[PDB]
Amino acid sequence: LKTANPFGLMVWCIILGTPSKGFGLYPKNSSWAFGRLRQNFIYSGTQVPP
Amino acid sequence: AQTGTVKFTQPLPTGVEAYWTGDWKGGTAAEPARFAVGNGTQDTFTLSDP
Amino acid sequence: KIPLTAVPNQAISFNAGSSYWKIRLYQNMDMMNADISRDGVIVCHGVRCFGGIPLLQYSHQYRPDYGNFVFDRDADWTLFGDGINLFYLDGAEFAEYQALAT
Amino acid sequence: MANYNYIVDTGVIVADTADVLSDVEAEFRAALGANINLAASTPQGSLVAAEAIARSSVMRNEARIANTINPNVSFGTFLDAICALMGIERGSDLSTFGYGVQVTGRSQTRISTGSRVQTPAGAIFTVMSDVTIPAGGVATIDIKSQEYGNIPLPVGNLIIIDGTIGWSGAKVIASTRVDPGSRQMSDAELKNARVNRLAIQGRNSTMAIKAYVSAVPNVTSVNVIENNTGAVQVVNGVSFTLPYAVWVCVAGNPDKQAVADALWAAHNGGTPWDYGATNNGVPVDGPNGVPVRDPASGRKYVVKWTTPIMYDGYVNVTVQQGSSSVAPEAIQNAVVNYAQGKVEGEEGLVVGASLSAFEVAGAIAREIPGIYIKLCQVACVAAGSPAPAPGDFTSEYVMSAFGQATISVGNVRVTFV
Amino acid sequence: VADTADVLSDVEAEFRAALGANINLAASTPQGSLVAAEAIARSSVMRNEARIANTINPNVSFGTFLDAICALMGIERGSDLSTFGYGVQVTGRSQTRISTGSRVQTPAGAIFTVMSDVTIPAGGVATIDIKSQEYGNIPLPVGNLIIIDGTIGWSGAKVIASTRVDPGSRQMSDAELKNARVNRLAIQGRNSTMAIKAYVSAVPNVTSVNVIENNTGAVQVVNGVSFTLPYAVWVCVAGNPDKQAVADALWAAHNGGTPWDYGATNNGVPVDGPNGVPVRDPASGRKYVVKWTTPIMYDGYVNVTVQQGSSSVAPEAIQNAVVNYAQGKVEGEEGLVVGASLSAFEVAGAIAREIPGIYIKLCQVACVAAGSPAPAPGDFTSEYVMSAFGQATISVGNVRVTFV
Amino acid sequence: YVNVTVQQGSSSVAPEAIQNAVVNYAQGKVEGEEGLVVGASLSAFEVAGAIA
């Protein structure tokens, strides 16, 4: 009921044998394109307002 | 009850608003549901939609 | 039943139900634990002890035709010989036992 | 170098402390030198004791969590092994109160946590301190010692600790009722909740239908058939292509709605109930059995069931006295209570169960031997019909599945030849 | 998973000892650094033991895996031995046959006798038997070789009247880590799709089960079988035991009106013509319908070219590896079952699983009919597809590897 | 360039996991596999073996 980590959710996927395609794992920094600055290489208001 | 028509016997005075509760054609009206606003002389009304 | 005594860690051996068993009972923090052996070959390690549920869980363990062990109430080594016992049921009795369980 | 692989294919081996302590001492001696001193006073003794305590502690802590998703375990782990399906914990409430009765002197203050006891000697305290107006009436709020679902008997209380000028701790029905939970689920009735849920789930519908419909009180027997075709499979059920056929027999069914509620829980999400072709068993109500909406936040469904068509049978018997005296009424009662199945091994004249004079003679022989039997013949006809002719009796009567047979005390007639 | 990161278990002890007293050494292996090394070892070992105990996934566990099964799934298969009933026995009059008379079948049987018997004056008696070991070769009716007998016992034989059963053994953890995904014995949930396979697979001797449901209102919508009667389902099982057990199991897991369906003339051979007559019911009614089939025994062929490896590797290693995979002994992959298509890449993966350090250049897989002449050299191709009711096995002689 | 055709089955994993796993295979992460050394032919059968 309070499994917060994607680790436990994937473990339960293995236990019950469900797939894991449609489920979003994590918004964490381990995911691609995130950082504590991460302002670089983007349309930063000088080029285009996003 | 199958046709959803109701009849008051005595004509209602002005400004008396009635409600109804129960079940009809699947829809439920557990909370009070307005169906009539007595205009002063009419005593034939019909039920509302849950 | 089985002869026991009030010691926090012991082991008793016996020949019951045409089989040779060696059981070990020891206190581990809060609840008890058990080690069950047969033939001199270990069967299970650290079986947690509860009152009314059998000690052997797995089908290949308790019987093709063997028996099983049940504690009437939760074990407490201070009370052995007074109010708390360990009983042994042979194959037919254990089968009707499991029939009655559900 | 002294480590043991104590986790094996079998389980966890937890060692006695002498062994781990000797291992730790050997490790420290190999670290420093074979002549080192390891006693409590010396610092090395403190270090080795700390190491031994820590190692044994971590080993035991691992061993306690060895096998946990097996539902034998307890204390929080079992809570969520349960809640994966359904289950509650906590439940440790204490019966709060309201609207007490106190009569005292003028402008007197009541000291908190006073002790008020009721007639079977249950102790309940007060909650908030309060003063008394000069008239002599105030209300208190109560809390007992143990967090149990205790019930206050509707009688005036008794005082254990007395403040100044204070008496008559009594009740008014205006007192609010807070019925508390009392640790209702400790450890083992969770296992029994598992047992009951697994038992309910394990059955099919047809298996569950009869057992769970027989749960209603005063019921006698229930016959359930699945059509399995649009043809006449057992009875002429050609209502729909794939219905369920339900026949319930009862001694009155004091609650009409109970059997409907029982049928409601026995649904499969894809099977209609409508059965019969205006010739099978007569349903209690035509279109629907007007089920109760839902036990939990739902809407009003429909179910349909039918009862067997009532019949009645006439029994003739010719006997000789033999070598003892037997009153005919005794034999009449014998047959009649046999028809109900009072004796084990015989289920009765249940719905869709024929009657044979051979079985009646068997009952008579079973109860009272020593009485010879000449002839016993049987007959059956629809309910309420006058007495049929002497030619209407036969050896056996084949009977329809949607019919129920009964035998009356005076309906059976005996002859003493 | 969640089992790594023991490399930093050293700097912690160094900083610990430094913080304890000033700033001094913790190097060059004096008594202080020896205490530090001891701390290193114990902390690393404790963390390793924690990581071993933590990970309890069905694809990772061992021995404690049985509780991961018992959370949902049915218990493992207990070892059992198959008995004999009504074995003929002839001798002189008024003789008693005592228990555990070690009768011996001609291929080293070593059968026992269950209940003591006294030979009637008619000279013809029937004695119940029981085998000695879990591994028992199916015998043949002959005069059983006698080891222990009385002064009157003459001979014993096996008549056709005797009815036998089969044993059960060899349930290794590979089968447990394989049958987790499929044998979801949801005894709790009976009338469904995933439930029927698992409840049927509880029957002894049964290897695999397929159940394909139409879910529509038109014919020929499932992967591999025709319909005839719509709104139904068809069942195929392999390694089938006697009828009644699987019949009861199948009837006990459905609920629909007429879900039974024979497929068509293009399907596995039906076990019985009209039905299977499941006599008894919980409702005591005399209902009778059970319809189910068996698969078609195909045959597969494999030919692969590889390199020679770090050292000499005999072809028997590759043959044993591919045969072992086909039988389904390897954990994870169920091998070849009713409705599984051979794949060259999968076979190469199995070979790499068993014997690594070899460079496979070419892979070929072909399938042949039952009893058909051996496939021509041009028959092999990269990929073969099997239908729902097609079972294929591989022997040692169906794989040849002449590697460059 | 490698192309792989796989059906999901009952338990499925994100394609990025296979991507990282195979790419880190190419340098020989696993025991017994030297990797794509100079002059070493590349075969999809070994990619199948790696994912197996």
From TrEMBL, chain A:
**At the top level of its lineage, which domain of life is listed?**
Viruses
Protein's recorded name? Putative structural protein
UniProtKB/TrEMBL annotation, chain C:
Domain Cyanophage baseplate Pam3 plug gp18: start-end pairs: 1-90
Q: Name one Pfam family in it.
A: Pam3_gp18
**Which branch of life, at top level?**
Viruses
The molecule here is called: Cyanophage baseplate Pam3 plug gp18 domain-containing protein
Organism placement in taxonomy: Viruses, Duplodnaviria, Heunggongvirae, Uroviricota, Caudoviricetes
From TrEMBL, chain D:
Every copy of the Baseplate protein J-like barrel domain together lies at 101-161
Q: Which InterPro entries match?
A: Barrel_Baseplate_J-like (IPR006949)
Q: Under which name does UniProt file this protein?
A: Baseplate protein J-like barrel domain-containing protein
Supply the source organism for this entry: Pseudomonas phage vB_PaeM_E217
What is the taxonomic lineage of the source species?
A: Viruses, Duplodnaviria, Heunggongvirae, Uroviricota, Caudoviricetes
